[PDB]
Design a protein around this ligand. Structure first.
Ligand SMILES: NC[C@H]1CC[C@H](C(=O)O)CC1
Ligand SMILES: [Ca+2]
Length: 223
């Protein structure tokens, strides 16, 4: 997260870290057994880390649970990142508490201009590299579809939206992939892709979760 702030320990209790020897992506807990992340975060051997603040220090509220299965969206296209969504099942149910909590799925899509919270352990520098260790947060609005498509002509599908600031300075960044965009208490986005971080006219692009709620619910119910 570039241009954000330190969330505060466990203030985003649905935020998870995906770990394969090291943190490599975010995700969002949607019930005690299931996490939603980006399909481009897929790999084998994932451990889901819940209740994290400092990802380099055991602080006492963590739960580390291996994934038993991953399900990439059937229509995911790795070249264009269309349908950049994946479900991860936990081998044992998380113990839900005030610091480890699920986020509700959308009942409808959110409007342009709605303010959202984006969070993650990614790079905090728009030029160069610095990783923060504690969870960073950013308040950012959903941008109009026309401004999104103007920023990335030929690349935005109906399964994507932009959020952030066309003037730059505040954005998601490397290592935030797969993490949440929450608006009005619902998981509306997944950190998906962009061009650089916090550059003018290059906002972050997010998977449009509201298009996937039926697939999420049916997939969880059958797996
Ligand atoms: N600034 C958006 C940001 C989205 C994730 C991406 C990635 O890490 O794959 C990097 C760019
Ligand atoms: Ca920790």
């Amino acid at each position: 997260i570039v241009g954000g702030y330190t969330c505060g320990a466990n203030t985003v209790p649905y935020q998870v870290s995906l770990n394969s020897g090291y943190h490599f992506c975010g995700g969002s807990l949607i019930n005690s057994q299931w996490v939603v992340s980006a399909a481009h975060c897929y790999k084998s051997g994932i451990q889901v880390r819940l209740g994290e603040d400092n990802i380099n220090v055991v602080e006492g509220n963590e739960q580390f649970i291996s994934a038993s299965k991953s399900i990439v969206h059937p229509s995911y296209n790795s070249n264009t990142l269309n349908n950049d969504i994946m479900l991860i099942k936990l081998k044992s149910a998380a113990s839900l508490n005030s610091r480890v909590a699920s986020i509700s799925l959308p009942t409808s899509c959110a409007s342009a201009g709605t303010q959202c919270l984006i969070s993650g352990w990614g790079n905090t520098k728009s030029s160069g590299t610095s990783y923060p260790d504690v969870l960073k947060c950013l308040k950012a609005p959903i941008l109009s579809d026309s401004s999104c498509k103007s920023a990335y002509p030929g690349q935005i599908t109906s399964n994507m939206f932009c959020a952030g600031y066309l003037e730059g300075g505040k954005d998601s960044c490397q290592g935030d992939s797969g993490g949440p965009v929450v608006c009005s208490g619902k998981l509306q986005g997944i950190v998906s892709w962009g061009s650089g971080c916090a550059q003018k006219n290059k906002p972050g692009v997010y998977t449009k979760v509201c298009n996937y709620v039926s697939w999420i619910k049916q997939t969880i119910a059958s797996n």
